[PDB]
Design an enzyme around this catalytic site. Structure first.
Site, short mmCIF file in Angstrom:
data_model
loop_
_atom_site.label_atom_id
_atom_site.label_comp_id
_atom_site.label_asym_id
_atom_site.label_seq_id
_atom_site.Cartn_x
_atom_site.Cartn_y
_atom_site.Cartn_z
CG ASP A 162 15.28 -13.71 28.68
OD1 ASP A 162 15.47 -13.37 27.50
OD2 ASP A 162 14.26 -14.35 28.98
CG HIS A 207 19.37 -8.66 3.02
ND1 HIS A 207 19.37 -8.77 4.40
CD2 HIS A 207 19.65 -9.90 2.55
CE1 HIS A 207 19.61 -10.03 4.74
NE2 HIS A 207 19.78 -10.73 3.63
CG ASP A 241 16.11 -16.38 26.72
OD1 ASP A 241 15.52 -16.09 27.78
OD2 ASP A 241 15.89 -15.78 25.63
O1 LIG Z 1 16.86 -18.92 18.38
C1 LIG Z 1 17.39 -17.87 18.76
C2 LIG Z 1 16.98 -17.28 19.95
C3 LIG Z 1 17.57 -16.09 20.38
N1 LIG Z 1 18.57 -15.49 19.61
C4 LIG Z 1 19.20 -14.23 20.06
O2 LIG Z 1 18.34 -13.58 21.02
C5 LIG Z 1 17.26 -13.07 20.23
C6 LIG Z 1 16.36 -14.22 19.79
O3 LIG Z 1 15.30 -14.43 20.73
P1 LIG Z 1 14.76 -13.21 21.62
O4 LIG Z 1 14.09 -12.23 20.73
O5 LIG Z 1 14.01 -13.76 22.78
O6 LIG Z 1 16.12 -12.55 22.17
P2 LIG Z 1 16.19 -10.98 22.48
O7 LIG Z 1 17.59 -10.63 22.83
O8 LIG Z 1 15.52 -10.25 21.38
O9 LIG Z 1 15.28 -10.85 23.80
P3 LIG Z 1 15.75 -11.57 25.17
O10 LIG Z 1 15.14 -13.06 25.11
O11 LIG Z 1 17.21 -11.55 25.36
O12 LIG Z 1 14.95 -10.82 26.35
C7 LIG Z 1 17.95 -12.45 19.01
O13 LIG Z 1 18.24 -11.08 19.27
C8 LIG Z 1 19.26 -13.24 18.90
O14 LIG Z 1 20.36 -12.35 19.09
C9 LIG Z 1 18.98 -16.08 18.41
O15 LIG Z 1 19.86 -15.55 17.73
N2 LIG Z 1 18.39 -17.27 17.98
MG LIG Z 2 13.22 -15.49 27.36
MG LIG Z 3 17.20 -16.46 22.91
#
Ligand SMILES: O=c1ccn([C@@H]2O[C@H](COP(=O)(O)OP(=O)(O)OP(=O)(O)O)[C@@H](O)[C@H]2O)c(=O)[nH]1
Ligand SMILES: [Mg+2]
Ligand SMILES: [Mg+2]
Ligand SMILES: [Zn+2]
Ligand SMILES: [Zn+2]
Lengths: 164, 98, 43, 114, 783, 263, 85, 196, 133, 65, 49
Positions: free
Chosen positions: E147, E749, E145
């Site tokens: 971030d 689960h 992403d």
């Molecule tokens: O392939 C993905 C990537 C990201 N995500 C969404 O983001 C996370 C997956 O990837 P991340 O673990 O990087 O997202 P995070 O929110 O935990 O940490 P940040 O990168 O935002 O700092 C999960 O919490 C999910 O909600 C997915 O659902 N699928």
């Molecule tokens: Mg990231």
């Molecule tokens: Mg993500």
RNA sequence: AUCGAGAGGA
């Protein structure tokens, strides 16, 4: 249990069956019992499916487990891959774990196998046996800075004639 | 119906940085942690004498601002006088793509 | 500053968990993620 | 430090001139005009006014990257009508509305108190 | 490890990544100050001389320019200083270390790099603002992403290194990844939600836009397409103008649930070339699914073409949504009053049904359950009841939408969120899971001090009653907090664990590659498997296909393949063939029609034993289904004109192709058998599809025609071979080692059932790969 | 008269409320915008600090100063410094300002934009009067001073436009509405419960006919009659903003029509 | 010796992806050093892009040595390989 | 950073003129994404913003405190007496055209945190700079003009691809590269290359 | 060319199934018994109240671009009120001579069934649908 | 930290106003909102210029130097 | 607003971070695993405060 | 300029 199987009329039909489930293992004992099917009994321990039915079965019960971890997680991976893992684990005669116990003590290179674990003591008894090295595996040519025999380097180019 | 004691007030299970999160009881509980990861990394006014000290590295916000929405507890941590952020007007909307 | 002053370090059966008796002593959500997680604590 | 100097939004750079017309490779009797250092303020205007012209088959505009004022507009008209003329007559009208809305505002102002 | 298998390197860069919905798939936005400091050792050719001499004057500051000028005599001419910087006499045969330039091959990388995908060739567009920007649908396989994620990029230094970059590692090619025999890049975020919006039947757009939209697609042929509506006000349908991105000869047919060629639900999908006919476009189509658009565009048209397509969708949808808005607001979780009482009165009925169970075991009337503790069943018994509650009372919020509910629309597109995300908030939170069991008596016989000892009801042991919207009661908070911690804890552990299993798996097949005899070997040169993946086919050229020969009745079978020319009832009516009434009767060629059928019944008996279960879909090379639709177009066929072939054309021809489908070439004998054996399955399909009473009844081919399909099936097969050289070891491991990292719950689960604790998560994979002596949950499952 | 129509409602020294009749949306918005960006103005650009013993650090002080407003009345008769022929700046393109507060009192010694001095020759024109709207006479609190605090800087103010910085924007906020019932169905009103009750009506309902449920949706309808209110920061009295607004929007349509004849 | 004869070659006449990625690369290394070109240049002046046109018209003078595992090898010219791919 | 662990980087600056706007003339500082929301399930973020606008209107102090008698309900009621669709949203117009926004868009004030990081203080490149003495490989540390590692991971990905000359190039022509001498009999480096 | 179909239909079901601008309609012909028709109407433009006769026709003309109408001196088969453009797809046969063609007008679908569609509805990627009164 | 000139989100010179806001409830014993409404701030983006704004310049000036 | 609780070691602000330990002189009982000789073990960390 | 520990980013 659910089980799909042909009705006489050619088509598959949903048919139920009673299946007994257990906590623990001792295969060569249960299968000799009266009234059970000794052709479809199964224990999740691939290390006893191996001991009792033979290396070739071993191969695919291991597979079944490797599989009932990816698909059960809802992920899909194409056979060929898990097959090749399952296979590499199987060819050397019995089961061969993917740890410095199993595959890495195997008679491969020397460099190529120290690029993993227990790095020095492999290089040592590599000079006690004065073991030769092929330099045909990957890591070997990575260490020497050669263009390793992979895809690109799988073959040789040159130099023909032609020119007439 | 056999009490002996009573809790001073239940927002006091929180530690110094969670007591900034507005509405912890409305977050999924991991993300309450992340705001305490950050927010430590988030710059404001590390002290008042900042223009009199000699420190490798120092970040001061041009215009800091007491949030528009506090924790009752914030007030004993002196956030409202040494705040670490700004009051932006945020538009939760899909736009040009970026 | 005001956190790094009230911190709590643990050397090295379920140590990283937020054990029940934590109530009102250690914050349930202030902790460092990855690395040494749950091991480091805040008051 | 990778930041494009501000005044590169309205001052014309060097080489770069304000209009560049090129034959439309694809459509009969068509053209693509490139506007250097100019954008939505003026792109939308010329498009949605130019659509009023009844002898106009096609007209559209687009800023291609938000990083640059440079916007494109492509214009198709009917056999015997020059694209360029169609622009001229469109631009002219917009002149006229705004030289009007000026004086119509002018007198309403004067007449108001406080 | 630190210094030989993994060196610090030159000619590289790393910054923060951004979305750029205006960049195209295979590109990378590399900021000036970077492609102002990276150089490519380019030689002086009479070809590039002119566009080089001006790079020297210009030097290291203005962009398109150079740093060093490299002569013959070893000596380096350093033109950021130098007396001679403002001139130079360039001969051919020197080197000019020019700056990196717009449209160059570079390698883009993002660590953890655990994927022949984390590594891709991109084109370079030099740009202001000091970020790498990359286009939005190369986001799934790098797994980033923005971030604050950042990323890596090295620049080749040799003319072939850069060829070997773009001709192998180029993103376009990498669209369909050999992991999962399906594409790994698709449409997401705005673009996804949006395409679902833009594509509703309700969704119309008028002239003004339908002009800019068309102008927004770069390879548009400058023809406004005729609108759906021409009555008062000529509206264009959403669908219609999106079909402008879809290229030609692209055929797709799906069907979702209750779907009837008329789509009451407006679901399913049908593309009849170029334009879409009905259905609603989302993740299941325009997403990196198994058999949707992206998968189909790439095999059908090509990488370069599909990689263009990707961009074209976004330019449009993005532009449409730009000018249509959409959003989400707390009120999007404000579920309906007369249902609110309903939800809470549904937990209330679950709450009092744990009572009677508690009151039962406390009165000693609960038994046994079999193969468990007195206690242990009750523990199971309560988690069921309390998940049952959460999930019912969840779907009372899932029905209480609300199509103009922002949230559901996302989940309904498949752009973000899931059903659980909707049950959580709006409705209720649920049971709090720790160490597989519900919250444990931390304090002696009670979980907190504000409870009484020996209390076995829901919130004494961590049921969060409320939603997120109502807010979590202190007691609950800490509970949620607990399970919370465990979630984070065993991330910074599942990651750590996986990334050992990957590495072990990697250093253990490292070198198993496919050789120039299609057998698979290692360093020693031991055979491991004699034909890569038992058929000799690169996974990337594979699709699941129905078999059909397996299922259906024998009655259903004898009305699909039986051409009894002798039987005046089971012949091919002169309606179908140019021959027909001349073929009825006859014996010379009935003996061929006969032995076609017999081969087809032996197929049916054979498959029934290979696939015991009935399941008739299997990944197989060359999509036959799709080569017919191609023939049903490329040759403009009228389902009223009666072929022109002989029977002999069909039956003989198909056997010849059968022998032309080479995989192993050897002139011996044992090999000529493994030829048969690795071809065997595919053929049963091929036999099933190109059979007589089908090629004339169902899909109504001509000669002309056919020969085309015949040559095509051959030409497509041969292209689907594994290319000897293909380094298969790395490919195996990587492909099993990555799901690993993106697994959840090393519990599960299944933990409502306090005994269907069959050991999975990573732990399982650890026990298998360790070849463990002492496995945790061993089991007979007798039949 | 002729085309596009105006009908003022309120007209303060700082606010113009009006309706706008018989215009394209395309033109209204493009007037709302050219208002924001693109209208010449005057503000401080080159701040040359001599002494600053303040609590405030140099380039802060010297960023407020920019934001501070300056009378841009006759701005149309003063060359852009990019255009001028003089070295760096002359009286024909730039106006030069000097601040100069010493501290003095035991009490805090505030500094206002009232405190600025014009030094440049004005030739005789309405430019460079720090705009003061505050009642007591001292608009904009620049900076405080305790006791011996000194502050003395020289300023150069150049002509500019809010497309460069927003210091050059004479706009403030611009209110703007069209069709208050949604008879164009440009939107679609969210509700959990009801459109009509959940959203309030605009202050503008007063002027336009309601819908009458018994009638089919007006399809061939068009974007028309817009409800603008314009503020003014104070460099230009509201009217001229919305005049020069129409004026610039015209003037740079000109440069195009022109550019066509050249190439 | 060693060398397996033309008659009895048992590999893939179809050019592998890797083979060509190297063919194009090696001819690009020559072309870059302005050594003689073997086709009519249609305005094209990018080393790599030229090699494509040369591999198009089958006018490249380089034979491929393919090594089977035992030690022997097979020889194909970029003059006789199918470049379908 | 919001106050909840919405993170984000600015993908683009926009001017007011290009930005969406509410009939009153307001304009966001700050334009995240719908999707930010169902994934991460932060609701407080949504509340804090609601009751925060209300707190800009009222002149009252907002009260975010945990276990209280604040609800969305209690609040809304306290906004739609100040006059905005009582669950946040606002009707806006696209900036480019002026057209209305076909869907209305939760909009309201909130905190944002300026964390360290960003950007011209991690952005880095190198084309041969300085190297170590102990290995003749390039030095670690962005600042020190380092060079970024091609970790054993990376190598793996390079092989999968089969792009092998580039794997050699990454590993010779940048980084190390060296020419030694061997004696064709004994096989070490005893050779004393009395060169030239 | 010229026309391909002409009849008068009796609307038997208006259905607002989760939409707001479109409705699925249901109708059978006054003239002949054994026939039925299904159609997705833009209800917002031509409102339809149940039991509400309409006249339904099919042409193939009244190929380069669609240009803005400019009916200063133009001519279509426009005598009618409601008109769409579409594509025919499946050519289905319900047992014996009964037959049904399916039409898509930018996603708005039409399922027409009868028998005397005979020598008329060839797969012509043309077909305009027209409705009056 | 010395009250802003113009508010960020609109740019209504909220500069000269700070001192006044300090008088209208110190002297003119008012409540917040009503004091903003009188100062000129209908739009809460400006209205939030001054309700959040914290004035530290007050303290830095207290240090003697 | 400085509250203290740190030391100064060459212009540098140093904080003492509290350390955890198992408490002494509490007698605890522990079950000991399957493949070993001893079923139960009781432990006490005797030390003088 | 190297070895040691911690803090922080994915
Ligand atoms: O392939 C993905 C990537 C990201 N995500 C969404 O983001 C996370 C997956 O990837 P991340 O673990 O990087 O997202 P995070 O929110 O935990 O940490 P940040 O990168 O935002 O700092 C999960 O919490 C999910 O909600 C997915 O659902 N699928
Ligand atoms: Mg990231
Ligand atoms: Mg993500
Ligand atoms: Zn001058
Ligand atoms: Zn404001």
């Amino acid at each position: 249990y659910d089980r799909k199987v042909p009705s006489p009329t050619g088509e598959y039909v949903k048919e139920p069956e009673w299946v007994l489930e257990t906590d623990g293992v001792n295969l060569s004992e249960v299968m000799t019992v009266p009234g059970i099917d000794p052709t479809r009994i199964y224990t999740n321990s691939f290390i006893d499916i191996m001991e009792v039915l033979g290396i070739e079965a071993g191969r695919a019960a291991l597979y079944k487990e490797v599989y009932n971890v990816i698909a059960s997680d809802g992920s899909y991976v194409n056979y060929r891959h898990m097959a090749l893992l399952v296979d590499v684990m199987t060819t050397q005669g019995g089961l061969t774990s993917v740890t410095r116990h199993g595959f890495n003590r195997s008679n491969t290179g020397a460099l190529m196998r120290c690029s993993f674990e227990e790095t020095v003591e492999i290089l040592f008894e590599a000079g006690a046996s004065a073991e030769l090295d092929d330099c045909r595996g990957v890591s070997e040519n990575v260490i020497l800075g050669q263009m390793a025999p992979i895809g690109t380097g799988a073959f040789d180019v040159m130099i023909d004639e032609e020119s007439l | 119906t056999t009490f002996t004691h009573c809790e001073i007030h239940p927002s006091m299970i929180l530690g110094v940085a969670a007591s900034i999160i507005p509405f912890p009881d409305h977050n999924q509980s991991p993300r309450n942690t992340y705001q305490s990861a950050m927010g430590k990394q988030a710059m404001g006014v590390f002290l008042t004498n900042y223009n009199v000290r000699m420190d490798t590295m120092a970040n001061i916000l041009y215009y800091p601002q007491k949030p528009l929405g506090t924790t009752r507890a914030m007030e004993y941590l002196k956030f409202r006088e040494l705040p670490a952020g700004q009051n932006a007007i945020v538009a939760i909307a899909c736009y040009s793509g970026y | 500053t005001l956190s790094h002053l009230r911190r709590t370090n643990t050397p090295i059966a379920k140590p990283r968990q937020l054990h029940n008796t934590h109530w009102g002593l250690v914050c349930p959500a202030e902790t460092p993620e990855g690395q040494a997680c749950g091991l480091v604590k805040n008051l | 430090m990778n930041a494009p100097d501000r005044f590169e939004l309205f001052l014309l750079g060097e080489g770069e001139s304000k209009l560049k017309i090129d034959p439309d490779t694809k459509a009969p009797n068509a053209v693509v005009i490139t506007f250097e250092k100019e954008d939505h303020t003026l792109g939308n205007l010329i498009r949605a006014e130019l659509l009023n012209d009844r002898k106009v088959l096609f007209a559209a505009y687009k800023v291609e990257h938000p990083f640059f004022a440079r916007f494109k507009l492509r214009i198709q008209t009917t056999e015997g009508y020059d694209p360029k003329d169609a622009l001229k007559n469109a631009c002219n009208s917009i002149i006229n509305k705004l030289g009007a809305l000026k004086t119509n505002f002018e007198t309403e102002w004067n007449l108001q108190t406080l | 490890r630190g210094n030989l298998m993994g060196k610090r390197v030159d000619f590289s860069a790393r910054t923060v990544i951004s979305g750029d919905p205006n960049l195209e798939l295979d590109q990378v936005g590399v900021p000036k100050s970077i492609a102002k400091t990276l150089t490519y050792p380019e030689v002086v050719t009479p070809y590039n001389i002119d566009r080089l001499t001006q790079l020297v004057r210009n030097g290291p500051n203005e962009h398109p320019g150079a740093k060093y000028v490299i002569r013959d005599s070893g000596d380096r001419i350093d033109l950021r200083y130098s007396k001679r910087a403002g001139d130079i006499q360039l001969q051919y045969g020197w080197k000019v270390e020019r700056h990196i330039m717009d449209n160059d091959p570079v390698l883009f990388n993002r660590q953890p790099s655990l994927h022949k995908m984390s590594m891709m060739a991109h084109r370079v567009k030099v740009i202001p603002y000091s970020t790498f920007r990359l286009n939005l649908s190369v986001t799934s396989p790098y797994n980033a992403d923005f971030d604050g994620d950042e990323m890596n990029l090295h620049v080749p230094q040799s003319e072939e290194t850069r060829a070997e970059l773009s001709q192998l590692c180029a993103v376009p090619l990498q669209i369909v990844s050999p992991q999962s025999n399906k594409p790994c890049m698709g449409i997401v975020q705005d673009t996804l939600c949006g395409i679902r919006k833009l594509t509703l039947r309700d969704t119309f757009i008028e002239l003004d836009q339908v002009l800019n939209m068309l102008y927004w697609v770069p390879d548009w042929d400058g023809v406004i397409p005729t609108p759906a509506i021409i009555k008062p006000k000529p509206l264009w349908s959403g669908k219609q103008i999106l079909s402008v991105a879809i290229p030609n000869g692209i055929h797709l047919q799906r069907f979702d649930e209750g779907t009837t060629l008329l789509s009451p639900k407006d679901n399913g999908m049908l593309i009849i070339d170029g334009q879409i006919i009905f259905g609603v476009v989302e993740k299941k189509t325009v997403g990196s699914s198994n058999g949707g658009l992206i998968h189909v565009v790439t095999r059908e048209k090509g990488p370069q073409v599909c990689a263009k397509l990707f961009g074209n969708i976004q330019k449009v949808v993005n532009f449409w949504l730009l000018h249509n808005g959409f959003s989400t607001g707390i009120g999007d979780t404000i579920a309906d009053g007369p249902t609110m009482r309903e939800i809470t009165e549904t937990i209330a009925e679950a709450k009092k049904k744990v009572l009677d169970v508690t009151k039962e075991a406390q009165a000693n009337l609960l038994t046994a359950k079999h193969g468990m503790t007195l206690r242990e069943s009750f523990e199971d018994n309560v988690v069921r009841f309390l998940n049952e509650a959460r999930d019912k009372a969840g779907r009372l919020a899932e029905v209480n939408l609300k199509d103009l509910n922002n949230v559901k629309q996302m989940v309904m597109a498949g752009s973000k969120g899931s059903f659980i995300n909707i049950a959580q908030m709006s409705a209720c939170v649920g049971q709090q899971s720790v160490e597989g069991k519900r919250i444990a008596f931390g304090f002696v016989d009670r979980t907190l001090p504000h409870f009484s000892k020996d209390d076995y009801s829901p919130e004494s042991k961590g049921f969060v009653e409320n939603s997120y919207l109502r807010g979590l009661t202190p007691q609950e908070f800490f509970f949620h907090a607990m399970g919370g911690r465990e979630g984070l804890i065993d991330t910074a552990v599942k990651t750590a664990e996986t990334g050992y299993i990957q590495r072990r798996l990697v250093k253990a097949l490292e070198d198993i590659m496919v050789h120039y005899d299609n057998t698979t070997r290692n360093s020693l040169g031991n055979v491991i498997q004699f034909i890569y993946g038992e058929d000799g086919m690169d996974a990337a050229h594979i699709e699941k296909q129905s078999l059909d020969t397996i299922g259906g009745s024998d009655a259903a079978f004898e009305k699909r393949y039986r051409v009894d020319l002798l039987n005046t009832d089971h012949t091919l009516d002169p309606s179908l063939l140019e021959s027909g009434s001349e073929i009825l009767g006859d014996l010379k060629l009935q003996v061929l029609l006969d032995e076609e059928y017999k081969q087809l019944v032996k197929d049916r008996k054979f498959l029934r034993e290979v696939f015991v279960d009935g399941e008739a879909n299997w990944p197989l090379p060359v999509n036959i289904r799709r080569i017919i639709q191609n023939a049903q177009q490329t040759f403009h066929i009228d389902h009223t004109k009666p072929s022109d072939l002989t029977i002999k054309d069909i039956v003989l021809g198909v056997k010849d192709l059968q022998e032309n489908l080479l995989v192993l070439r050897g002139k011996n004998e044992i090999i000529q058998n493994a030829q048969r054996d690795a071809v065997t399955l595919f053929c049963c399909l091929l036999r099933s599809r190109l059979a007589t009473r089908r090629v004339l009844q169902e899909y109504r081919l001509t000669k002309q025609a056919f020969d085309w399909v015949l040559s095509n099936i051959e030409a497509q097969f041969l292209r689907s071979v594994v290319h000897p050289g293909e380094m298969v070891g790395v490919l195996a491991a990587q492909s099993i080692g990555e799901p690993a990292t993106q697994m959840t719950l090393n519990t599960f689960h299944f933990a409502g059932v306090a005994s269907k604790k069959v050991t999975s998560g990573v732990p399982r994979l650890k026990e298998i790969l360790n070849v463990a002596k002492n496995m945790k949950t061993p089991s007979l499952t007798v039949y | 008269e002729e085309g596009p129509q105006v009908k003022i409602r309120e007209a303060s020294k700082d606010n113009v409320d009006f309706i706008l009749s018989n215009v394209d949306l395309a033109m209204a918005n493009s007037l709302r915008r050219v208002m924001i960006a693109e209208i010449p103005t005057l503000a401080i650009d080159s701040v040359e600090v001599e002494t600053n013993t303040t609590v405030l650090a140099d380039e802060f002080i010297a960023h407020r100063l920019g934001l501070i407003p300056l009378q841009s009345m006759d701005i149309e008769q003063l060359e852009y410094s990019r255009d001028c022929f003089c070295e760096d700046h002359c009286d024909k393109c730039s106006v030069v300002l000097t601040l100069q507060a010493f501290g003095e009192s035991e009490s805090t010694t505030n500094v206002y934009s009232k405190d600025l001095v014009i030094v440049s020759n004005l030739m005789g024109r309405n430019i460079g009067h720090p705009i003061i709207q505050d009642k007591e006479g001292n608009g904009v609190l620049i900076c405080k001073l305790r006791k011996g605090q000194e502050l003395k800087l020289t300023c150069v103010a150049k002509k500019g436009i809010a497309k460069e910085h927003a210091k050059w924007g004479p706009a403030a906020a611009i209110e703007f509405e069209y069709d208050p019932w949604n008879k164009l169905k440009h939107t679609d009103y969210w509700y959990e419960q009801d459109s009509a009750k959940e959203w309030p009506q605009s202050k503008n309902c007063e002027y336009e006919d309601p819908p009458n449920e018994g009638d089919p949706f007006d399809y061939k309808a068009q974007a028309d009659t817009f409800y603008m209110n314009v503020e003014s920061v104070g460099s230009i009295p509201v009217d001229q903003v919305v005049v020069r607004g129409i004026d610039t929007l015209q003037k740079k349509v000109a440069s195009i029509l022109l550019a066509l004849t050249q190439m | 010796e060693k060398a397996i004869p033309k008659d009895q070659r048992a590999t893939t006449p179809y050019m592998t992806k890797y083979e060509r990625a190297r063919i194009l690369g090696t001819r690009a290394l020559q072309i870059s050093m302005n050594a003689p070109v073997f086709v009519d240049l249609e305005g094209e002046t990018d080393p790599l892009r030229i090699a494509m046109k040369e591999l198009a018209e089958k006018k490249i003078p380089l034979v491929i040595r393919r090594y089977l595992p035992d030690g022997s090898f097979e020889d194909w010219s970029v003059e006789e390989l199918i470049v379908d791919l | 950073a919001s106050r909840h662990g919405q993170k984000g980087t600015i993908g683009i600056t926009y001017r007011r003129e290009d930005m969406p706007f509410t009939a009153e003339g307001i304009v966001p500082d700050l334009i995240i994404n719908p999707h930010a929301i169902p994934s991460r399930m932060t609701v407080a973020h949504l509340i804090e913003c609601l009751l925060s606008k209300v707190a800009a209107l009222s002149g009252n102090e907002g009260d975010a405190s945990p276990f209280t008698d604040i609800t969305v309900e209690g609040i809304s009621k306290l906004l739609r007496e100040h006059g905005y669709q009582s669950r946040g949203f606002e009707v806006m117009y696209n900036g480019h055209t002026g057209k209305k926004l076909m869907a209305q868009i939760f909009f309201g004030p909130t905190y944002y945190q300026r964390l360290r990081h960003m950007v011209d203080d991690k952005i880095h490149a190198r084309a041969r700079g300085p190297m170590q003495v102990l290995t003749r490989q390039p030095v670690e540390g962005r600042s020190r003009d380092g060079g970024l590692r091609f970790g054993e991971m990376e190598r793996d990905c390079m092989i999968a691809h089969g792009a092998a000359s580039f794997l050699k190039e990454r590993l010779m022509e940048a980084s190390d590269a060296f020419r030694v001498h061997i004696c064709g009999i004994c096989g070490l480096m005893t050779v004393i290359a009395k060169l030239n | 060319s010229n026309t391909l179909f002409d009849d008068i239909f009796q609307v038997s079901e208006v259905d607002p199934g989760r939409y707001n601008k479109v409705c699925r309609i249901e109708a059978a012909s006054t003239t002949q018994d054994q026939c039925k028709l299904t159609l997705d109407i833009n209800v917002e433009l031509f409102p339809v109240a149940a039991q509400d006769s309409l006249t339904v026709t099919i042409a193939s003309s009244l190929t380069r671009s669609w240009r803005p109408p400019q009916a200063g001196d133009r001519s279509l088969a426009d005598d009618y009120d409601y008109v769409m453009y579409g594509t025919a797809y499946k050519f289905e046969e319900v047992s014996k001579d009964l037959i049904a063609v399916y039409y898509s007008f930018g996603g708005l679908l039409m399922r027409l069934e009868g028998n005397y569609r005979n020598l008329n509805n060839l797969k012509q990627e043309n077909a305009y649908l027209l409705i009056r009164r | 930290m010395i009250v802003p000139v113009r508010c960020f989100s609109c740019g209504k010179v909220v500069g000269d106003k700070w001192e006044s806001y300090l008088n209208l409830l110190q002297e003119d014993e008012l409540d917040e909102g009503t004091a903003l409404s009188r100062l000129g701030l209908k739009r809460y983006c400006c209205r939030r210029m001054i309700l959040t704004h914290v004035d530290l310049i007050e303290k830095f000036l207290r240090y003697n130097p | 607003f400085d509250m203290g609780g740190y030391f100064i070691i060459n212009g540098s602000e140093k904080v003492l971070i509290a350390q955890e330990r198992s408490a002494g002189n509490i007698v605890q009982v522990f079950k000991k695993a399957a493949p070993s000789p001893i079923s139960h073990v009781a432990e006490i960390r005797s030390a003088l405060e």
